[PDB]
């Protein structure tokens, strides 16, 4: 009933290999029964749940900023394989609720 598609910034990220890369997923909740998921489009062409909070490869992490709406989707020690298209999604724990998919973003790993 409330269309609250999270925002997922920035659109493109360039980081040198070995440097930590962090995104920002912002979701304005209507209830506290909700989870945020961290997705990448695998070579299988599928949304791979990289991490999620509330709670894998610890190299992809998700942190809740104490502001109440913004979470940091972070990939430590970024590797050239990590390049691709990512997104975040929030699932309200409501009886029939589902996934609200944010817009996608790109990560690019350099030398």
């Amino acid at each position: 009933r409330p269309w609250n598609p999270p925002t997922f910034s920035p659109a493109l990220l360039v980081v040198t290999e070995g440097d930590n890369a962090t995104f920002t997923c912002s979701f304005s909740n209507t209830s506290e029964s909700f989870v945020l998921n961290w997705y990448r489009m695998s070579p299988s062409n599928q949304t791979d749940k990289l991490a999620a909070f509330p709670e894998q490869d610890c190299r992809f992490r998700v942190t809740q900023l104490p502001n109440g709406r913004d979470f940091h989707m972070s990939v430590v020690r970024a590797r050239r394989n990590d390049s691709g298209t990512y997104l975040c999604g929030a699932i309200s724990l409501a009886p029939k609720a589902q996934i609200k998919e944010s817009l996608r973003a790109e990560l690019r790993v350099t030398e």
């Epitope: 009933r1 409330p2 269309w3 598609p5 489009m41 298209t85 589902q98 998919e101 817009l103 996608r104």
Partner: antibody
């Protein structure tokens, strides 16, 4: 230059089924959500269905709930709407519209006309 | 639902006149409202997004303004090819709702 075109519309009888397709080009089809919107002649526009980018979540209006099913193929870059138990009210030209999440219906196809008559 | 009432239903103005279309919502939709141009027998065209932002490729004469419930579309200098029907739609919540529609007619 995003291009969207519909296909599969024609004369359908009360009840029965009919499948609609929307061929997408000019953008990455998986990145933005897709939706359907119908408009009976001499009537306003009506939201009917919507599907997420990956397709993990589908959304339906209460009028078409339990009868229409929206679906997506990402390799073919095409949006499908499987319409079941069609009624005379369902007669309308349906448009496939890309969704920028909030800025919904950002681009519109010309739409295909579905006639529900015996 | 978020009831959308769009006033007026039709209007007639000559070339170069300031036209005004009012979109009124049942519940507040923040700034999530979009304006669409539907020429007769054609697909709708996005004009204004986020209540007041102007879509690329849309002439600057179309202007959007609105906060809360009532938003407004305004054409600076009406042109002959601007004959179309204009709808307002919210992006706040489901189900997505449009207005009745306002038919703008050119005067000659």
């Amino acid at each position: 230059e995003v291009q969207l075109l519909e296909s599969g519309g024609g004369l359908v009888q009360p009840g029965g089924s009919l499948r609609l397709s929307c061929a997408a080009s000019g953008f990455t089809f998986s990145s933005y959500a897709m939706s359907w919107v119908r408009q009976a002649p001499g009537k306003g526009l009506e939201w009917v269905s919507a599907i997420s980018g990956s397709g993990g979540s589908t959304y339906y209006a209460d009028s078409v709930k339990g009868r229409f099913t929206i679906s997506r193929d990402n390799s073919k870059n095409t949006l499908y709407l499987q319409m079941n138990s069609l009624r005379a009210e369902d007669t309308a030209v349906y448009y496939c519209a890309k969704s920028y999440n909030h800025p919904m219906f950002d681009y519109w196809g010309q739409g295909t006309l579905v006639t529900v008559s015996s | 639902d978020i009831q959308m009432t769009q006033s007026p239903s039709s209007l007639s103005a000559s070339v170069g006149d300031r036209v005004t279309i009012t979109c009124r919502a049942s519940q507040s939709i923040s700034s999530y409202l979009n304006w669409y141009q539907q020429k007769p027998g054609k697909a709708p065209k996005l004009l204004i997004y986020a209540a007041s932002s102007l879509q690329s490729g849309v002439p600057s004469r179309f202007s959007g303004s609105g906060s809360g419930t009532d938003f407004t579309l305004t054409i600076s200098s009406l042109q002959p090819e601007d004959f179309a029907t204009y709808y307002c739609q919210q992006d706040y919540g489901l189900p997505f709702t449009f207005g009745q529609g306002t038919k703008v007619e050119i005067k000659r």
